[PDB]
Structure formats: C-alpha cells, structure tokens
Design a protein around this ligand. Structure first.
Ligand SMILES: Nc1ncnc2c1ncn2[C@@H]1O[C@H](COP(=O)(O)OP(=O)(O)O)[C@@H](O)[C@H]1O
Ligand SMILES: [Ca+2]
Ligand SMILES: [Zn+2]
Length: 613
DNA sequence: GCGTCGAGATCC
DNA sequence: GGATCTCGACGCTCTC
C-alpha cells in the first residue's frame, strides 16, 4: 500500500526535504503526506481523502515549491482562498489569486507577471467561474503550458457547472497532473467524486475521519435555562477561548447573544435577518477575536470559515441531520488541540424541526424526516461511543471502540458513562389504545407517558393506565420515542392559539404490521495541580497571542497566520529566546524569525528566569 | 383554550 | 438527590 511512495531516496528528496524544513518549518510528516508528496512530484494524478485539519494543504503546497512553474488551485470560496494566500505570504512563498474580487489593473498585472521568463508565482488560486469567463486566464495558462511552466491542477475541495469545467481544463491541458482533495465523509459521495473526475490511473490516499481532539457530549436541555447553561459551561471550561453556539431560530440567537452580553461575555448573533455587511462585521470580529468571543448562529453561518482555534461548538438545539451536525461540530479544533462539541437535547426541538419540514415544498419531505430521525437516534443512543456512532453513520466500520478508553483526555460522554426485553405485548396494547383514541389523535406523547405509568396526572385512568408500572419515567419516555422513530406510532402537528407546535400521537405506517402481522419489538432498558513555570508558560502564551494580534493589524493578516496556536503553544512552553532552540519548533522558520522574531523574542526574554526547571 | 416547563411542596 | 404531584406563567419559524 503505496510502499514505493514511502522512499527518501528519490532525486527530488533533497530539495523537497530542504523546503519542508526551511520554508515550512516542519519536522514530521502526518499520515499519507510523504506518499502523496512523492506521488505528485513523480507526476502521478492524486486523489486525497483527509478529514478537516488533517493537513491537506501541504500535499500540494510542498510540491508547488519544488516544481518549476505554477500550481493552479481551484477553490470555490473567496474567503478560503484569501486565508491560504495569507499563510503562504507569511511563509514568504509567492502566491496570488484571481476571483473577480481583484482590480482590472491588478488582475492584468498578475497576467503580466505570469507571462515573464520566470513567473515567480508558485501558487495561483482561482475560483471555478474563472475557468470559463476569463479568456485572459486561459490564454495565460496556454502560454505557461507551451513553456512547460503549468506544474499541476489542484481541486482543493472537490465536493454541475464546476465538474464539466474542470474536465474542460484536462481536455485543454492533458499533460498537466491533477490532484483532488476532499474532506467529505460520505462514502458514496467519495466514490462519485473519484469516478466523475475520470483521472487516468489515480493514486488514492485515504484515512480515518476520526478527529482525535474532538470531545463529543450530549446533555439534556432545560429550554428556559439553556442560555444560562451555555454561559456557566463557557466560564467554567473556556472563558478566554473562541466558540460557536448554534441555535434553531433567529430569535434564539438574539436571546443567546443578549444573555451572554449581560454577563460581560463578548457574544454576537449571526443569522439571515442581519444585513450582508452586518454579517461580515460579526464574522471578522469573531475570526480576529476582536470584540467577539462567541458567535450565536443559525445554519446561515459556517460555509467558508476555517478559523483554526475554535475551542467549542455548542448546539443549543439539535441540528436537522447528522451530516449537518458533523459539519457544524467539525468547525471545532482544526489545529489538533482539544476542543469540545456539546449538544443540548430535548425531544420538543424535534417537533420544532418537524414544523420547519412541514413548511417546505415536495418525497424530499420524507428524506428530511429520515435525516432528522437519524439525528434523534444519535441523541437517544446513550450507550454506543459518540465517535463510533458518527463514523458508522458515514460508512466507517472496524474503528477501535476502545479509543476513548485508551485516550481518556478526549473521551466522549457515552464512554465515560443495559438490558433487553420483547415488549411486543406492551406495544400491541399501546397501538390498540391509540387506535381507539384517534390534530388526529386525542393525546400527546407526554399524556401517553402519564397514562402508561399510571400517573395521578393522567388524562384517562383506563386502558393502558398503569400498564407500564414496571417502567421508570425515563424508560417509558424512551419507549414511546422509540415507537415514533420505528414508525409504529406517528405525530400530527397542531398549531395552537400561541403559534406552538403540538404533537398528537396517532398510528404510524407500521402499526397494522405489529398487530396483524408479526413485527417483534425489542426495547433495551437504561438508567440516566499547577506549577510556577506552567503558570509563567500560560502567561507567556497570552503575551505571544497579543504580539500576533498587533503584528496581524500592521501586516493586514489574521493573527493565526503570523504563528498558529500549536507554534505559539510550543514557543510558550520553551520559554527560550535562543533561535537554535526556536528552530526545532514546528512552524518556526528563519523567514518568520526575521519578520516577527524581534516582537516574539522580546516576550520570551522576560521569562528568562523560568526557562530552566 | 390548553400543552408544556419549571419551581415549590411533598414523602423516600 | 431523587421521585411525583400541583400550580402558575408563558407560549413564536432554518438556509441561497
Ligand atoms: N506534517 C505536519 N506537521 C505539522 N503540522 C502540520 C503538518 N501538516 C500540516 N500541519 C498543520 O496542520 C494544520 C491543519 O492543516 P491543513 O492543511 O489546513 O488541513 P486541511 O486542509 O486538511 O483541513 C495546519 O496548521 C498545518 O500548518
Ligand atoms: Ca483546507
Ligand atoms: Zn467514545
């Protein structure tokens, strides 16, 4: 499995390794990086599957530096292009972009530079619409191609009027290699991407999509106190760190933001109800940690944000699909540092999302109900490892269920925290009871749970009243939720006089199958320091961060593009002002110590006494 | 008009 | 600390 691509004896190895160490300041290759770098430098077409934060950028940026000529990178978002170019400029790697969001005089200047004997530009980032609308671009690529200075085509996020366009590039310039990258976890989509690009004999580099540093939690939601719960959890676990709070509605964003602001927390709301410039202002404040620590957002927020130091993502209400949850929680810890993914769950939010699906135009309504049901299952599954649940959902099996046990510092709540019964007789009695009391039904799920348990609060004291005497309230609630998810029972939403969605229970499509036929129902029962030096290291880190923020203002660059969180962390841990020591740190380079070194070394020299333990 | 949530009051 | 009942507010919808 790519054994030939594991060699460090190729004619290219020496210049490649020197660029790895001297330009990038790196020391060790991550999974499949060396293999993909070697394959690309040999002129092989590559297909790379890595999760977010895996290190996909190096796979084309290191070869781009080694190769003579220009590596053309096709990317869909202007913001992701701007951020990549900032990283490369910071490292003194000649890079630029053409997105339309460039002056006509400035774009013409990029074409002028590209047509020179030595184009100098190693990486050119383009938007997919430039492949079709820019004759000036294609004529420039034609010129580079005739001169053997078109090194590679990169499709940074491979994900209609995009794929036929990338195929146009291959037909126009067939001898230039192609590298395609994707972070999509969906195994059928990974196959569709690979077959659709139709690349000749591709080298395919894939790996586990398990984000080792993401700690997944699901907590019961107290709807009237969720904002105070988020607030307390933030001040206890991440008072000085950036985060996102995902909320179901625009009003809930404004409420969440207002509550946090009243406690002195720098929080801002982000939803489509805001103007485009107001949204842009919120996003920039949040990325730069400048007047915004917490973004309280609807699904309107996300696409095109690569902030590497998000320490928490809180879902104040569950999302509408597992894919959405995976993408939203996935915004956390892109730098590999421990980050938290916390979801506040209540079944009441499920029927709030069910009324959102009932407001749409259609089979597509049944699809969204199914996707939602898959998300409710993840919430209700308080037994299986949260990592294994998400991975199994995206066709990744064989994964170690002992991961959260082997690495307890990044454990999910299910691994930190079981029987079985043939309840078919009980469900047959529930089904015959809701048949007789079938807005389309007479009772809600809560009413049904009271009756079943034989509660004094029950609205009827006959039929199934007390039938569930052997179940606890928690198990009776779980039993009824299971029947709705299993389509044995169904819910009809009724809008009351206060615009509240009320779910009345009726028979589902599988009710006649449980009684008439024999659909056996199985239910499973459940029950629910410090050091003087370490403190100085912590103090030095805050100072080092402030340095990057002031340098960021003067260079017109995001602070994390000066030095990332891992580099900053390691720099603070060293407490050294000696370059010989600083150059062994990942991301520390001669070019960066020249640019930023004076400001960085002046902070480190103040901790001179604590350098040696 | 009425379902739902959560605080307050019971007994364990 | 639960478990269980009763009373009294308060109730509201996501993306190009
Ligand atoms: N071999 C490596 N050693 C150390 N850091 C690395 C290495 N490869 C990548 N990184 C860093 O890991 C982080 C995530 O990489 P990135 O290219 O942005 O990931 P992706 O595109 O897969 O989401 C970046 O900060 C990057 O500089
Ligand atoms: Ca990327
Ligand atoms: Zn686990």
């Amino acid at each position: 499995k790519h054994e030939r691509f594991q060699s460090l004896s190729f004619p290219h190895t020496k210049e490649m390794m020197k660029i790895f160490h001297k330009k990038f300041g790196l020391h060790n290759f991550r999974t499949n990086q060396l293999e993909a770098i070697n394959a690309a430098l040999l002129g092989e077409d590559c297909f790379i599957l890595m999760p977010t934060g895996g290190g996909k950028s190096l796979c084309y940026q290191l070869p781009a530096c080694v190769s003579p000529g220009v590596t053309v990178v096709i990317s869909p978002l202007r913001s992701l292009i701007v951020d990549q170019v900032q990283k490369l400029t910071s490292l003194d790697i000649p890079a630029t972009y053409l997105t339309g969001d460039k002056t006509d005089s400035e774009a013409t200047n990029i074409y002028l530079q590209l047509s020179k004997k030595d184009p100098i530009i190693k990486l050119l980032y383009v938007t997919p619409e430039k492949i079709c609308a820019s004759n000036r671009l294609i004529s420039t690529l034609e010129n580079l191609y005739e001169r053997k200075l078109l090194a590679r085509f990169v499709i940074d996020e491979a994900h209609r009027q995009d794929y036929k366009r990338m195929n146009m590039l291959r037909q126009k310039f067939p001898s230039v290699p192609v590298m395609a990258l994707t972070a999509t976890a969906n195994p059928r989509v990974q196959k569709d991407i690979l077959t659709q690009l139709k690349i000749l004999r591709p080298q395919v580099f894939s790996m586990s999509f398990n984000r080792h540093n993401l700690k997944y939690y699901v907590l019961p939601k107290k709807p009237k106190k969720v904002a105070f719960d988020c607030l307390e959890w933030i001040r206890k676990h991440h008072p000085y760190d950036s985060g996102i709070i995902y909320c179901l509605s625009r009003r809930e964003c404004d409420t969440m933001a207002d509550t946090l602001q009243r406690d002195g927390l720098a929080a801002l709301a982000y939803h489509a109800g805001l103007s485009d410039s107001a949204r842009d202002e919120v996003q920039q404040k949040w990325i730069n940690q400048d007047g915004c620590q917490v973004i309280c957002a609807t699904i309107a927020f996300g696409m095109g944000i690569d902030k590497p130091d998000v320490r928490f993502v809180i879902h104040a209400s569950l999302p509408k699909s597992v894919e959405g949850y995976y993408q939203e929680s996935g915004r956390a810890g892109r730098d590999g540092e421990i980050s938290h993914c916390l979801l506040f769950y209540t079944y009441h939010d499920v029927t709030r999302l069910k009324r959102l699906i009932m407001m749409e135009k259609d089979h597509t309504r049944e699809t969204h109900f199914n996707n939602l049901y898959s998300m409710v299952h993840y919430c209700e599954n308080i037994t299986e490892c949260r990592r294994i649940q998400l991975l199994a959902y995206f066709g990744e099996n064989g994964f170690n269920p002992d991961f959260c046990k082997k690495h307890p510092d990044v454990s999910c709540d299910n691994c930190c925290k079981y029987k079985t019964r043939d309840v078919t007789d009980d469900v047959k009695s529930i089904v015959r009871f809701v048949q007789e009391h079938s807005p389309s039904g007479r009772f809600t799920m809560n009413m049904l749970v009271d009756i079943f348990l034989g509660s004094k609060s029950a609205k009827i004291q006959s039929g199934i009243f007390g039938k569930g005497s052997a179940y606890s309230r928690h198990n009776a609630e779980r039993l009824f939720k299971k029947l709705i998810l299993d389509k044995i029972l169904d819910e009809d939403l009724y809008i009351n006089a206060n615009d509240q969605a009320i779910a009345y229970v009726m028979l589902g499509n599988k009710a006649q199958t449980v009684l008439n036929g024999n659909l056996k129902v199985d239910f499973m029962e459940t029950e629910n320091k410090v050091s003087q030096r370490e403190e100085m290291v912590k103090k030095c880190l805050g100072e080092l961060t402030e340095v990057c923020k002031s340098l960021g203002k003067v260079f017109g660059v995001h602070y994390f593009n000066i030095f990332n969180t891992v580099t900053l962390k390691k720099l603070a841990e060293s407490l050294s002002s000696d370059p010989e020591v600083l150059l062994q740190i990942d991301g520390v380079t001669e070019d960066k110590l020249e640019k930023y070194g004076a400001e960085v070394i002046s902070v480190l020299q103040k901790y001179s006494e604590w350098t040696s333990p």
